[PDB]
Amino acid sequence: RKMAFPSGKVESCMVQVTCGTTTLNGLWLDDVVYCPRHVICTSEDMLNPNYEDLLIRKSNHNFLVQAGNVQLRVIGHSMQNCVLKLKVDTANPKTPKYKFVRIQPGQTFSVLACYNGSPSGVYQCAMRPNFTIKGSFLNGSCGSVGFNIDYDCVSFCYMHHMELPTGVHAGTDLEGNFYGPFVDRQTAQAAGTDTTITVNVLAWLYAAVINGDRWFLNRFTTTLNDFNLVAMKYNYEPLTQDHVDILGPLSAQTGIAVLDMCASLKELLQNGMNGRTILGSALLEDEFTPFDVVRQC
Amino acid sequence: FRKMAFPSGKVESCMVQVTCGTTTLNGLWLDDVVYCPRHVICTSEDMLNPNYEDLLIRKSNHNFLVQAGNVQLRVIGHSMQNCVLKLKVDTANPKTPKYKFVRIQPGQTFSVLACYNGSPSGVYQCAMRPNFTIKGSFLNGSCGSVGFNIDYDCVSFCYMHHMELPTGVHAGTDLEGNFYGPFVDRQTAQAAGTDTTITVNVLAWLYAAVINGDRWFLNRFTTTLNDFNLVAMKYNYEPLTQDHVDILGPLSAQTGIAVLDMCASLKELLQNGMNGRTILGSALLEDEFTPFDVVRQC
Numbered sequence A: 001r002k003m004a005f006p007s008g009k010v011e012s013c014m015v016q017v018t019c020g021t022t023t024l025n026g027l028w029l030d031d032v033v034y035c036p037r038h039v040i041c042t043s044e045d046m047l048n049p050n051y052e053d054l055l056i057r058k059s060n061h062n063f064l065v066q067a068g069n070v071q072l073r074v075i076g077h078s079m080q081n082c083v084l085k086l087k088v089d090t091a092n093p094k095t096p097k098y099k100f101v102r103i104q105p106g107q108t109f110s111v112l113a114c115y116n117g118s119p120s121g122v123y124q125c126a127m128r129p130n131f132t133i134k135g136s137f138l139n140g141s142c143g144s145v146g147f148n149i150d151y152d153c154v155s156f157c158y159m160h161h162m163e164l165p166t167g168v169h170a171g172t173d174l175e176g177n178f179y180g181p182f183v184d185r186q187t188a189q190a191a192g193t194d195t196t197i198t199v200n201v202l203a204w205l206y207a208a209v210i211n212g213d214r215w216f217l218n219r220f221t222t223t224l225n226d227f228n229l230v231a232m233k234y235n236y237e238p239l240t241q242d243h244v245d246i247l248g249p250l251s252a253q254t255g256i257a258v259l260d261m262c263a264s265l266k267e268l269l270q271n272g273m274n275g276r277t278i279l280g281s282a283l284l285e286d287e288f289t290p291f292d293v294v295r296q297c
Numbered sequence B: 001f002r003k004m005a006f007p008s009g010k011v012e013s014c015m016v017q018v019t020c021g022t023t024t025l026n027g028l029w030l031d032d033v034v035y036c037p038r039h040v041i042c043t044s045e046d047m048l049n050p051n052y053e054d055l056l057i058r059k060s061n062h063n064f065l066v067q068a069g070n071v072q073l074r075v076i077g078h079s080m081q082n083c084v085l086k087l088k089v090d091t092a093n094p095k096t097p098k099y100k101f102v103r104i105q106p107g108q109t110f111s112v113l114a115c116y117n118g119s120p121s122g123v124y125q126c127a128m129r130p131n132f133t134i135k136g137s138f139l140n141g142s143c144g145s146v147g148f149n150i151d152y153d154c155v156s157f158c159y160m161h162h163m164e165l166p167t168g169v170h171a172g173t174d175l176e177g178n179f180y181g182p183f184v185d186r187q188t189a190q191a192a193g194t195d196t197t198i199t200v201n202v203l204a205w206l207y208a209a210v211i212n213g214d215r216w217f218l219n220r221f222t223t224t225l226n227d228f229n230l231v232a233m234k235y236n237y238e239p240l241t242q243d244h245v246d247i248l249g250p251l252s253a254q255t256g257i258a259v260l261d262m263c264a265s266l267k268e269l270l271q272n273g274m275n276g277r278t279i280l281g282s283a284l285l286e287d288e289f290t291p292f293d294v295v296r297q298c
């Protein structure tokens, strides 16, 4: 099953940021608050914003940053790509060890969905190959963040900005650079056709073998190039050299070579499951990374 | 539409490690009491057939090692309440949330904070099954992990983890130490009663699918409550009560689909199957979202 990281370290970093009547969420680390830059927009502004000109008309005293109902005075502001950095007069005493990372398609993370600076729920998400996430976000959720935790260190990888017409979600890394070709303007935008995350399907097949569900293992192997060309005919992502390497631990644990598992997946694509299940599922799951498999055990 | 858990921070601040002899598991530290599964006092041999009152009288306060992070909490008293041990410690938890202990009913959902050696590992959503098991994700050392819900800064603790059945589902207690289901904290093979599907939750999920634009399973037919329940019981679904119909009111109002209309859609799903189609990306009918869960997320 999907498991989110414990969210407590991130909960103590969530604040609300208001400009005029626009309120969204921000992330308070040390004495800086990070939030989506469209907080400075009026509803009419969002249709066609000039962020450089809009930010010129703003001063520190136009920004209301609150931890709960407690105001944190803003003493400086700057724009970095599509995020606003608000320097505040108080360093967050609950700042965790952290870093900012830009993730690849296929990688998973936990989202802490927040409204008015108040955490509401937590769930695991994957970055799709088309650079959207299949999230759960309502009005006011912008500035909610996605993250991973590794031994006391929080790696922030996503800040939420928008919802696309197909119901999927788009946002930035914590340096304000969008994942994908999207822009923070209220104008017609559309996600590209998506694909299946091959490396994660392979990880999930390894998990099935580890648990004794191994009927789909076949007696063939393939080359990575041959597999990549066939996979694309089924709307599956091609594998990178990095994908092969992150499957190494699971390949070692099961004694099933990566390219043997690739050949087994190829048969599943060309012939289906013939009514059978894998880990109880009739569908091939693609939002568990090799790291998620290892973490779950 | 995602299986969303409550933010776990308020509970993380309460998790500690409890050790007795060479048995280690998790405890929940609230004010000056640590609550944990009583089988922490058992050796490996004791667990095969424990007499807990006899085992407990032979322990002293100093046999219990409680660690909150790196700091040990001195145990100054102890008692047993059913299958839960209560350790009085000389230090009150400074981050004790507003909380209550509640016993939940089958079909209700809660968040689990899975912990190992007193340290939180992951958070996920579970339902209490009609047969009083839970389909959790728990490994060695997970005992004393808790399940909870949060309502406006108040934590309602409903579950503490004790054991895994041979089928791979899980059994535990409320925070008064009473098991959900006909199980006991003895290491011996135990089966649960045959499980059933949580009908009111399946209906809430079908409403979530319609809210999200997935309508292929709807039909023009309708049914009475009794005729729906006849088919539901035939397929090992729980009866739908009038209370359930009322609880679904907000979702019927939002979608403009009468509850008994949605029942007729579910009846055909049960009799015809999904024909290789999916609902909200699932090939099976999902029954671990309550109506409240759907309302909160949507």
Ligand SMILES: CC(C)(C)[C@H](NC(=O)C(F)(F)F)C(=O)N1C[C@H]2[C@@H]([C@H]1C(=O)N[C@H](C=N)C[C@@H]1CCNC1=O)C2(C)C
Residues within 6 Å of the ligand: A024, A038, A046, A137, A138, A139, A140, A141, A142, A143, A160, A161, A162, A163, A164, A165, A169, A183, A184, A185, A186, A187, A188, A189, A190
């Ligand atoms: C769907 C909405 C049509 C209204 C619009 N979308 C498109 O214009 C697109 F279709 F082009 F994407 C859109 O998201 N926004 C319009 C305006 C901001 C953003 C926005 O309101 N963000 C919300 C943050 N609080 C989170 C949203 C709320 C609903 N669910 C979410 O996740 C910006 C791009 C500057």
Ligand SMILES: CC(C)(C)[C@H](NC(=O)C(F)(F)F)C(=O)N1C[C@H]2[C@@H]([C@H]1C(=O)N[C@H](C=N)C[C@@H]1CCNC1=O)C2(C)C
Residues within 6 Å of the ligand: B025, B039, B047, B138, B139, B140, B141, B142, B143, B144, B161, B162, B163, B164, B165, B166, B170, B184, B185, B186, B187, B188, B189, B190
């Ligand atoms: C599966 C195990 C066969 C070993 C046994 N099960 C049965 O004896 C049953 F069949 F009766 F359930 C069982 O769980 N235990 C044996 C012994 C305690 C409990 C136990 O080890 N609890 C663990 C807490 N740290 C959590 C477990 C570990 C694996 N996954 C879990 O969730 C007690 C009942 C006293």
